[PDB]
Amino acid sequence: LAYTFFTSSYAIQSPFPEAAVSRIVVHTRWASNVDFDRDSSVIMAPPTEN
Amino acid sequence: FGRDCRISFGMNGAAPMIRDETGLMVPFEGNWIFPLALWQMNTRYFNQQF
């Protein structure tokens, strides 16, 4: 496929990652903006990472 | 044409097609009807194919 077909080539933001493979990872409050931190985050890495 | 106007590249010499309103893949020919808002949301892409 010519590069003109893909959306990324036009610098369009996407709601989802544009990748060959994507997975779901739990990351508590990864987008939150809080005033007081409860300092009990649970964060993993992608499964390719230990 | 409506809000859903997905375009598919033609492969191995076949002409590219754009989705009709009733859902039929049609080539880039003939007489079409566009709402203005349709072009606005896809200016860069449309202004490359047409």
Residue of B7, B11, B41, B44 to mutate when probing chain A, most A C-beta within 10 A: B44
* Cα A30 to Cα A21: distance, rounded to the nearest angstrom: 21
Residues belonging to chain B with any Cβ–Cβ distance to chain A shorter than 8 Å = 9, 44-45, 48
In DSSP terms, B27 is beta-bridged to B17
* Cα B20 to Cα B24: distance, rounded to the nearest angstrom: 5
A residues 8-47 closer than 8 Å to B (CB): 10
Task: Kindly determine whether residue B9 and residue A10, on different chains, have CB atoms separated by under 8 Å.
Answer: no
Resolution in A: 3.3
* Cα A39 to Cα B6: distance, rounded to the nearest angstrom: 46
- Using CA atoms, how far residue B6 sits from A17, A18, B3, B18, B48, in Å, is 20, 18, 9, 6, 14
* Cα B27 to Cα B16: distance, rounded to the nearest angstrom: 6
Residue B16 contacts residue B6 (beta carbons within 8 Å): no
- Using CA atoms, how far residue B8 sits from A31, B33, B47, in Å, is 35, 19, 15
Residue of A1, A5, A7 to mutate when probing chain B, most B C-beta within 10 A: A5
Residue B28 contacts residue B50 (beta carbons within 8 Å): yes
Rg (CA), chain A: 16
Give the tokens for residue A33.
Answer: 């903006």
